[PDB]
Design a binder for these strands. Structure first.
Ligand SMILES: OC[C@H]1O[C@@H](n2cnc3c(NCCCCCc4ccccc4)ncnc32)[C@H](O)[C@@H]1O
Ligand SMILES: [K+]
Ligand SMILES: [K+]
Length: 546
DNA sequence: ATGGGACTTTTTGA
DNA sequence: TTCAAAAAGTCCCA
C-alpha cells in the first residue's frame, strides 16, 4: 500500500511551504512528513533546502559560527536538524535512508531523523515548522476493527461513525505544527462536503488558518486510482483576516502535466480562483464564486420548505447478498416462487427524469417465507446456493436473522405506494415518480410526501422543479462530488433541498404532467419534452427571481 | 496495455 | 431493533 504522488504536485506542495522561509533568521527549520514512504516529498525538501543554504552561505557564516557554516557542511546540517520522516513500512524507511545518505556521496556517523512507527501513536517529542505529505486513506469498510476502536477512543474529535483514517492525520499534523508553522497536504476531497467530515472541518477551521484549497474535483490525479484529490495549505500564524484562496478546476479531463509547474495550471483558464472568508464558514463549507453564492442565497431565502419538511425519506433494500435474492424476471427458477413473495426490482440506471424504466429483475422477499419446510424448494434450489455467504452476514452470525432472510428488508409498505425515486450517484438530477411499487437496493433512494403536505405539493410538481436546470445547478453547489461526472445523491443532502410555492405552481405542474404523458406513450418523441422543459425552467427562474 | 467510460454491494457504526 | 453513509470505487474495453 504505497502510492506515488505526481512530481508536479510534490514540487508545488514543498514550494508552497518553503518559498518564503527566512533561512538567515531561522537556519534550523524542522520539516516533517509523517507518511514519507520512500521520500517523494522529503527528497525534494532536501533539494530545496540545499539551494537555500548554499545561496546564503556567506551571510550565515558572518552572522553565526563561521566555522560551522560552510558549503561542505550543508549536507550534514540538513540531515541532523532539518529533515524528519515517519512511515510504518520499514522497507520504505530503509530505502529513504539510503537515498538521503547518497545525496552527498564512512566519514563520521551522520544521523538521520527517520522513524519507523505508527505516526498516530508516536509520542512526538516536539513540534515542527513545516509539515508536508500524502497521508493514507482508509475508509470504514477497509479499516481493521481493532485499530478503529483506538481511533474512536483517541481521535474522537475528528473520527466517529463512517469517518476516514486520513481525518486523524489532519488532526495529528495540526496538533504538532509549531506556532507560525505551515502545513500542506494532498488528501481526498470528500471531507469538504461529506457528512462524516463535519467534525474534521470544525477542527481545521478553529485551529488553523486555511491559506489555500486546490480542488481537482473528479480529475484523475493518481493514475489507476479511483479517488478525487485536493491540496490544502494552512498555517498557525497570527493574522487578522483569514481569507482562503480557492482554486477550483474548470474541466476534469485535464492532464496534470500540461505545464512544467502546477502554478501555471492554476493561473490558467483551466482553473477558476475565488476567495472565501473563513469566518463565514458554517458546519458546511460552501466554496463557490460570487455568482453562485448569489444564486444559492436567492434560492435559500425564497424557499420556505425543505424536502425533509414535507417528505419521508428512506434507503432501499439491503439484501446482503444480491445474487441469492435477485433474479431475472424471465428466470425459470421464478416458477418455484409464489408471486406473493416477488417484488419488482430496479437499478439506478433504470431511473430517468420523471419516470422509471420497466423492471427486468425480481426480488424474492424472503422474510415472508414462514418457515423452512413449506417452501423448501425456494430455499434449497435458489437461496441456499449462497448459504455459506449468507450465514457470514453480521446479523446471521448474531442470530438476529435466519440465514435465508434479507439483511435489511425494511418495511414493504414504504415501497408499495406512490413515491419518488432517484439514483444514489448520478451526473444530473434524475427524480422519477414510481407508479409500479418498485423495490430497489441502496443504489436507489425513495421518498413520499407526508399526508399533511399533499394539498400543497404534488408528486408531479416536485419532479418538475427537482428535474429543472435550476435545481440541478442548485443541488450541485453543495453536493458531494465523487468522481468524474458523478455526484452523490444521498438523503443527507437531497433532503436539505428547499422548495417553493407561488403563482407559477399550476403551470409548472401542468408542464410536468405533459412531460410525463409524452414520456409514457408508445410513439414517444423526446423533442417536445425538451421544449416543455425549457419553458418550465423559465417559469422556475421567474419564480425564484434569478 | 492504461486510460476512459458505464455503473454501482454490503459492510458498518450508531 | 433497524436506520443510512461510505469511492486510495470496480470492472470492462480498446
Ligand atoms: O500510503 C501512505 C503511506 O503512509 C504509510 N502509513 C500508513 N499508515 C501509517 C501510519 N499510521 C496508520 C496505521 C494504520 C494501520 C491500520 C491497520 C491495523 C491493523 C492491521 C492492518 C492495518 N503511520 C505512519 N505511516 C503510515 C504507508 O506505509 C504509506 O507509505
Ligand atoms: K561569524
Ligand atoms: K477521480
Amino acid at each position: 500500500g504505497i502510492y506515488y504522488t505526481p512530481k508536479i504536485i510534490v514540487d508545488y506542495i514543498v514550494k508552497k511551504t518553503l518559498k518564503n522561509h527566512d533561512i538567515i533568521k531561522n537556519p534550523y527549520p524542522r520539516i516533517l512528513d509523517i507518511s514519507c514512504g520512500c521520500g517523494n516529498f522529503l527528497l525534494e525538501v532536501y533539494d530545496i533546502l540545499y539551494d537555500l543554504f548554499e545561496e546564503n552561505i556567506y551571510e550565515l557564516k558572518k552572522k553565526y559560527d563561521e566555522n560551522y557554516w560552510t558549503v561542505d557542511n550543508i549536507h550534514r546540517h540538513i540531515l541532523n536538524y532539518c529533515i524528519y520522516g515517519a512511515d510504518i513500512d520499514e522497507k520504505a524507511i530503509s530505502i529513504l535512508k539510503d537515498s538521503l545518505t547518497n545525496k552527498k556521496v564512512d566519514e563520521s556517523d551522520i544521523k538521520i531523523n527517520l522513524f519507523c512507527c505508527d505516526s498516530l501513536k508516536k509520542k512526538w517529542r516536539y513540534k515542527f515548522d513545516y509539515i508536508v505529505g500524502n497521508p493514507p486513506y482508509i475508509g470504514h469498510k477497509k479499516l481493521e476493527k481493532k485499530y478503529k476502536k483506538f481511533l474512536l477512543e483517541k481521535y474522537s474529535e475528528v473520527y466517529k461513525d463512517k469517518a476516514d483514517l486520513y481525518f486523524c492525520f489532519y488532526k495529528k499534523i495540526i496538533d504538532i505544527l509549531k506556532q507560525g508553522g505551515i502545513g500542506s497536504v494532498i488528501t481526498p476531497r470528500y471531507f469538504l462536503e461529506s457528512l462524516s467530515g463535519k467534525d474534521l472541518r470544525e477542527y481545521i477551521k478553529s485551529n488553523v488558518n486555511v491559506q489555500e484549497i486546490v480542488d481537482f474535483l473528479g480529475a484523475n490525479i493518481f493514475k489507476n486510482i479511483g479517488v478525487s484529490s485536493c491540496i490544502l495549505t494552512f498555517d498557525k500564524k497570527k493574522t487578522k483576516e483569514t481569507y482562503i484562496d480557492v482554486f477550483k478546476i474548470k474541466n476534469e479531463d485535464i492532464c496534470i502535466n500540461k505545464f512544467e509547474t502546477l502554478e501555471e495550471l492554476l493561473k490558467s483558464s483551466k482553473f477558476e480562483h475565488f476567495n472565501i472568508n473563513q469566518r463565514l464558514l458554517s458546519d458546511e463549507w460552501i466554496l463557490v464564486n460570487k455568482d453562485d453564492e448569489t444564486f444559492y442565497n436567492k434560492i435559500q431565502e425564497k424557499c420556505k420548505y425543505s424536502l425533509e419538511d414535507i417528505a419521508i425519506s428512506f434507503q432501499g433494500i439491503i439484501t446482503g447478498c444480491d445474487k441469492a435474492f435477485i433474479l431475472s424476471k424471465d428466470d425459470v427458477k421464478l416458477n418455484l416462487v409464489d408471486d406473493k413473495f416477488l417484488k419488482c426490482w430496479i437499478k439506478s440506471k433504470n431511473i430517468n427524469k420523471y419516470i422509471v424504466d420497466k423492471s427486468e429483475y425480481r426480488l424474492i422477499y424472503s422474510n415472508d417465507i414462514d418457515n423452512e419446510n413449506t417452501n423448501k424448494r425456494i430455499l434449497d434450489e435458489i437461496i441456499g446456493l449462497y448459504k455459506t455467504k449468507l450465514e457470514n452476514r453480521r446479523e446471521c452470525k448474531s442470530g438476529i436473522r435466519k440465514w435465508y432472510e434479507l439483511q435489511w428488508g425494511r418495511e414493504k409498505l414504504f415501497f408499495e405506494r406512490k413515491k419518488i425515486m432517484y439514483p444514489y450517484k448520478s451526473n444530473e438530477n434524475r427524480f422519477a415518480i414510481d407508479y409500479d411499487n418498485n423495490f430497489s437496493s441502496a443504489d436507489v433512494y425513495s421518498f413520499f410526501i407526508k399526508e399533511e403536505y399533499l394539498d400543497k405539493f404534488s408528486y408531479e410538481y416536485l419532479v418538475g422543479i427537482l428535474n429543472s436546470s435550476v435545481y440541478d445547478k442548485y443541488f450541485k453547489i453543495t453536493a458531494k462530488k465523487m468522481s468524474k461526472n458523478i455526484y452523490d445523491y444521498y438523503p443527507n443532502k437531497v433532503m436539505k433541498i428547499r422548495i417553493f410555492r407561488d403563482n407559477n405552481y399550476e403551470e409548472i405542474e401542468n408542464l410536468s404532467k405533459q412531460i410525463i404523458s409524452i414520456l409514457l406513450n408508445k410513439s414517444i418523441d423526446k423533442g417536445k419534452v425538451e421544449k416543455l422543459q425549457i419553458k418550465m425552467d423559465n417559469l422556475i427562474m421567474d419564480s425564484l427571481g434569478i
